From Swiss-Prot:
It comes from Hepatitis C virus genotype 1b (isolate Con1) (HCV). This is Protease NS2. Palmitoylation is required for NS2/3 autoprocessing and E2 recruitment to membranes. Residues 1-3 are cytoplasmic. The chain holds residues 836 to 868 of 3010 of the full protein. It is found in: Host endoplasmic reticulum membrane; Host lipid droplet. Cysteine protease required for the proteolytic auto-cleavage between the non-structural proteins NS2 and NS3. The N-terminus of NS3 is required for the function of NS2 protease (active region NS2-3). Promotes the initiation of viral particle assembly by mediating the interaction between structural and non-structural proteins. It is a multi-pass membrane protein. Homodimer. Interacts with host SPCS1; this interaction is essential for viral particle assembly. Interacts with envelope glycoprotein E1. Interacts with envelope glycoprotein E2. Interacts with viroporin p7. Interacts with serine protease/helicase NS3. Part of the replication complex composed of NS2, NS3, NS4A, NS4B, NS5A and the RNA-directed RNA polymerase embedded in an ER-derived membranous web. Part of the viral assembly initiation complex composed of NS2, E1, E2, NS3, NS4A, NS5A and the mature core protein. Its cofactor is Zn(2+). Activity of protease NS2 is dependent on zinc ions and completely inhibited by EDTA. This is probably due to the fact that NS2 protease activity needs NS3 N-terminus that binds a zinc atom (active region NS2-3). The chain crosses the membrane at residues 4-24. The N-terminus of NS3 is required for the catalytic activity of protease NS2. The minimal catalytic region includes the C-terminus of NS2 and the N-terminus NS3 protease domain (active region NS2-3).
């Protein structure tokens, strides 16, 4: 309840959107283990 604490939710909304696009170039079952 003092400075900021207002647009924090807007920033999180974009972080989740960016992460969704980040998992589009990962190769499924690429490493041997």
């Amino acid at each position: 309840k003092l400075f900021l604490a207002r647009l924090i939710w807007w920033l999180q909304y974009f972080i989740t959107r960016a992460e969704a696009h980040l998992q589009v170039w990962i190769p499924p079952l690429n490493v041997r283990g």
